[PDB]
Amino acid sequence: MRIFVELTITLEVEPSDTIENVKAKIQDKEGIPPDQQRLIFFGQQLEDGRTLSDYNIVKYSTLHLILRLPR
Amino acid sequence: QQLTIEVLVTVDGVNFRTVVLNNKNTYRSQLGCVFFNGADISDTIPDEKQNGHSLYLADNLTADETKALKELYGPVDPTFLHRFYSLKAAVHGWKMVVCDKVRSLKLSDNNCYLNAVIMTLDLLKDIKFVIPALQHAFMKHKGGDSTDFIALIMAYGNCTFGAPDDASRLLHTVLAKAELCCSARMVWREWCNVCGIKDVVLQGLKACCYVGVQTVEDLRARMTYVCQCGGERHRQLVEHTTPWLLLSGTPNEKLVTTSTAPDFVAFNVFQGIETAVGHYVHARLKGGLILKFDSGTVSKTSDWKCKVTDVLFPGQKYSS
Ligand SMILES: [Cl-]
Ligand SMILES: [Cl-]
Ligand SMILES: [Cl-]
Ligand SMILES: [Cl-]
Ligand SMILES: [Zn+2]
């Protein structure tokens, strides 16, 4: 499964991956620390404990990225 | 030995277990990280004066104490209990003022972001936390003792004492462990020219909060993204019943004025530079002026150019 993270990058992911697992693969790409990562999907802030299945993250879903303030 | 004491140990204040200790080693070596009357006494030698009192344990939990830990706090990280106890002691130095029956957190150790979070949570009607420790600390907060709730949300939000943090991040992290006690719905009409039209429905607390927009007009605006088939997919709000709407966005400059009588009831403000340390201010719209609750201090102005982050709107009644 491929998803997109907002500039826009694309990640190869599985529906069982947690949000912390997604933030981990973002740090390997963009270098942003996972603590400073805010992932938004459908206006809902994603919690590290939950998986992409809980938020119904499907194919070609777009996750918005906001930095923790202060940046 | 020399002296033997029997203390009671708890992780939830309800269930206890007796531990026989010595005066030949510290609490940490015999029992672990323990707090007594809100103080880390782990590296002290047990005294006979502290015989039959209760200790709050932070590590070296038994099998049943981890079960009691999860039933009270939920699946927490291994450092949660030690951070929560440490935060609860440092927050005790803070002060919660109540000016005209609305609570505000005095400025201390860059806690202005906690002021915006707390003062916004006070306005959210019919909310209740699904975690017992959060709900217990929330009731004590609404009763006049907020140190438990302040330290808890800092522990769940992984906040460091004395360091500035994100008020919008913590506000939604806290709301993620809450539910709404009244009916609330929002219906997004999705459609792709290939697959077709499909409705999705969010009910409860998720139908009252959105991160990305800061005005209602931006919420019902048509949105475009990529469908599962790989084609263009659209989305638009077509039904919205709610008791209140919390719209959060990045700090955005806006001229909040009492000339047009805005429809929202409260909003948060981020003052300063984003890359540098900034100051959060909570604001409410009482009467016909803006009430800026700036961490214990109160101000009033008819107009204000500010970088708005969160906005709180009244009940929604919308359909199309
Ligand atoms: Cl945690
Ligand atoms: Cl209040
Ligand atoms: Cl306090
Ligand atoms: Cl169609
Ligand atoms: Zn399609």
UniProtKB/TrEMBL annotation, chain B:
<feature type="binding site">
    <location>
        <position position="195"/>
    </location>
    <ligand>
        <name>Zn(2+) 1</name>
    </ligand>
</feature>
<comment type="subunit">
    <text>Interacts with proofreading exoribonuclease nsp14 and 2'-O-methyltransferase nsp16; these interactions enhance nsp14 and nsp16 enzymatic activities.</text>
</comment>
<feature type="binding site">
    <location>
        <position position="192"/>
    </location>
    <ligand>
        <name>Zn(2+) 1</name>
    </ligand>
</feature>
<protein>
    <recommendedName>
        <fullName>ORF1ab polyprotein</fullName>
    </recommendedName>
</protein>
<comment type="similarity">
    <text>Belongs to the coronaviruses polyprotein 1ab family.</text>
</comment>
<feature type="domain" description="Peptidase C16">
    <location>
        <begin position="72"/>
        <end position="320"/>
    </location>
</feature>
<feature type="binding site">
    <location>
        <position position="227"/>
    </location>
    <ligand>
        <name>Zn(2+) 1</name>
    </ligand>
</feature>
<comment type="function">
    <text>Forms a hexadecamer with nsp7 (8 subunits of each) that may participate in viral replication by acting as a primase. Alternatively, may synthesize substantially longer products than oligonucleotide primers.</text>
</comment>
<feature type="binding site">
    <location>
        <position position="229"/>
    </location>
    <ligand>
        <name>Zn(2+) 1</name>
    </ligand>
</feature>
<feature type="domain" description="Ubiquitin-like">
    <location>
        <begin position="2"/>
        <end position="57"/>
    </location>
</feature>
<comment type="function">
    <text>Plays a pivotal role in viral transcription by stimulating both nsp14 3'-5' exoribonuclease and nsp16 2'-O-methyltransferase activities. Therefore plays an essential role in viral mRNAs cap methylation.</text>
</comment>
<comment type="subunit">
    <text>Interacts with nsp8 to form the replication-transcription complex (RTC): nsp12, nsp7, two subunits of nsp8, and up to two subunits of nsp13.</text>
</comment>
